[PDB]
Nucleic acid binder design. Structure first.
Ligand SMILES: Nc1nc(=O)n([C@@H]2CS[C@H](COP(=O)(O)OP(=O)(O)OP(=O)(O)O)O2)cc1F
Ligand SMILES: [Ca+2]
Ligand code: NA
Ligand code: NA
Ligand code: NA
Ligand code: NA
Ligand code: NA
Length: 324
DNA sequence: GTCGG
DNA sequence: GCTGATGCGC
DNA sequence: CCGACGGCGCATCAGC
């Protein structure tokens, strides 16, 4: 992609606006509007000279064009400069960095004068379990995970899953599967021949084994098909500890596995494109369905490889590396 | 906020 | 007790 | 003008 020195001032401005819309205004559609605009501008291979120029791009409209004109004329946006100074809004925005504190919790905290991590720390009884864990690992959860460490993590997960039952299949998806040099977390998809579209404790026994070997250290949420938690690589006799990392584990039916793998591999942006580009078809995380004459989705087609799904749409098979 | 019925 | 709604992360 | 904009699983809240 183009160098960030091209339009980084504009992209950074739009992303900061997007965050205030999500976290303070609770205006999720304006957050996505600003993100879309920032993304289309990030990809534009020219230094923008005017709001009119940017307005030609899809997702940039009248108001972002006007903001780009103020930014180019002054190096700032009055509106952003003001909200950055605002103790209430800045504090709400900041607290949403804690995993489990969304815009609603953040506002409620700030309204009670709880505005900093220090205030959260003093008020543990006002936090739910997930929020306590997000606070405990605030710094670690914002660190990226080098690929080297992801491989070590993958080694542990695959070894322990097979130890519980050698018929499991486990696949690390997300940016790792796309060969990224670092990841934000570990996404694991799990299946087992006994669990299909029509069919005990298959997710639990895996989570329990990873806990028994002290890889999984905390649990954010855990149901029959989705686990969200925290893990940590072991360190040698005295290296400093590794950071705690986020890990998800999803149990998916065997006959929907490849649609699962495709979906959770991503990127989010690739999937949107692959879905939008689907001829008389609709693809979700579970299935690929042929749309009828009226646009109604019919029955799921059988799938025994990611490629089958590319075939159905006559889409040129991209490998995970090329789904960016 | 942007798009498009 | 329970159902359904909302918040949340992704 | 005005509605769509992603949808899922789990934790927790609101209310019967
Ligand atoms: N909000 C999201 N909704 C999605 O459907 N997705 C889908 C399902 S998961 C897949 C991309 O996965 P992630 O969200 O794990 O992001 P990633 O692994 O590509 O990136 P990162 O290394 O986790 O930062 O695309 C992603 C989202 F972030
Ligand atoms: Ca991920
Ligand atoms: Na609002
Ligand atoms: Na435009
Ligand atoms: Na948060
Ligand atoms: Na109810
Ligand atoms: Na993820």
């Amino acid at each position: 992609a183009p160098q960030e020195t091209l339009n980084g001032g504009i992209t950074d401005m739009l992303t900061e606006l997007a965050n205030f819309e999500k976290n303070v205004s609770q205006a999720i559609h304006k957050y996505n509007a600003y993100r879309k605009a920032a993304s289309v501008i990030a990809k534009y291979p020219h230094k923008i000279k005017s709001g009119a120029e940017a307005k030609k791009l899809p997702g940039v409209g009248t108001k972002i064009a006007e903001k780009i004109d103020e930014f180019l004329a002054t190096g700032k946006l009055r509106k952003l400069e003001k909200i950055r100074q605002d103790d209430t809004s800045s504090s709400i925005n900041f607290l949403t960095r804690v995993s489990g504190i969304g815009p609603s919790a953040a506002r409620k905290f700030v309204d009670e004068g709880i505005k900093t991590l220090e205030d959260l720390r003093k008020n543990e009884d006002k936090l739910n379990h997930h929020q306590r864990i997000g606070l405990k690992y605030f710094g670690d959860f914002e660190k990226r995970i080098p690929r080297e460490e992801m491989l070590q993590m993958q080694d542990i997960v695959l070894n322990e899953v097979k130890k519980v039952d050698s018929e499991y299949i486990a696949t690390v998806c997300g940016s790792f599967r796309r060969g990224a040099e670092s990841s934000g977390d570990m996404d694991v998809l799990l299946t087992h021949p006994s669990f299909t579209s029509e069919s005990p404790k298959l997710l639990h026994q895996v989570v329990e084994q990873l806990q028994k070997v002290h890889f999984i250290t905390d649990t954010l949420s855990k149901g029959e098909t989705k686990f969200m938690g925290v893990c940590q690589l072991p360190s040698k006799n005295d290296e400093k500890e590794y950071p705690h990392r986020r890990i998800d584990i999803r149990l998916i039916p065997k006959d929907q596995y490849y649609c699962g793998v495709l979906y959770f591999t991503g990127s989010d942006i690739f999937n949107k494109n692959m879905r939008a580009h689907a001829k008389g078809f609709t693809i979700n995380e579970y299935t690929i369905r042929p749309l009828g004459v009226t646009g109604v989705a019919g029955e799921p087609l059988p799938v025994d490889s990611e490629k089958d799904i590319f075939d159905y749409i006559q889409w040129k098979y991209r490998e995970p590396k090329d789904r960016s």
